[PDB]
Swiss-Prot record:
Binds 1 heme group per subunit. Monomer. Heme binds at Y20, H68. Gene3D superfamilies: Globins (1.10.490.10). Keywords: Acetylation, Heme, Iron, Metal-binding, Oxygen transport, Transport. One of its GO terms (molecular function) is oxygen binding. Signal peptide: none annotated. The keyword Glycoprotein does not apply. Belongs to the truncated hemoglobin family. Group I subfamily. It comes from Paramecium caudatum. Pfam families: Bac_globin. This is Group 1 truncated hemoglobin trHbN. The modification N-acetylserine is found at S1.
Length: 116
């Protein structure tokens, strides 16, 4: 699985932490996370990604389309966020092909997150 190729549950956690640090460092998207519990964000997104990447635990959290309804996220903002995931994975030493396979899994939620 892609979850295994990445190094496991701790590897996905670390990437997810860097992904959110990157998002918060970018003014075009950081505003969305004002007042949000970031350790919880990291934990829930890492769990979501572990499941999506073929890990052993199915996602039992909230429905992402309902979660992101009327948040006002555009495709350019989603694409920027995918860039933050790409840089987090690359920075973690993930090989290019695997970076791209992982990014591909995170695109499938574009329809649930983007609303405008
Ligand atoms: C521009 C892109 C995105 C924005 C602005 C965004 C924003 C947010 C915010 C503000 C929350 C917290 C909502 C609340 O407090 O009720 C949230 C929750 C969440 N987001 Fe996103 N998000 C984005 C992309 C993603 C992506 C790419 C994923 C998965 C790969 C994702 C997965 C989640 C999950 C799993 C939760 C928590 C669900 C739960 O509570 O069970 N988000 N998002």
């Amino acid at each position: 699985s892609l979850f295994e190729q990445l190094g496991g549950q701790a590897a996905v956690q670390a990437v997810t932490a860097q992904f959110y640090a990157n998002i918060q460092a970018d003014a075009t998207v950081a505003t969305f996370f004002n007042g949000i519990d970031m350790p919880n964000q990291t934990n829930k997104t890492a769990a979501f990604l572990c499941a999506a990447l073929g890990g052993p635990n199915a996602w039992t959290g909230r429905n992402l389309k309902e979660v992101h309804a009327n948040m006002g996220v555009s495709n350019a903002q989603f694409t920027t966020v995918i860039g933050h995931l790409r840089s987090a994975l690359t920075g973690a030493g993930v090989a290019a092909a695997l970076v791209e396979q992982t990014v591909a899994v995170a695109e499938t939620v574009r329809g649930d997150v983007v609303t405008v």
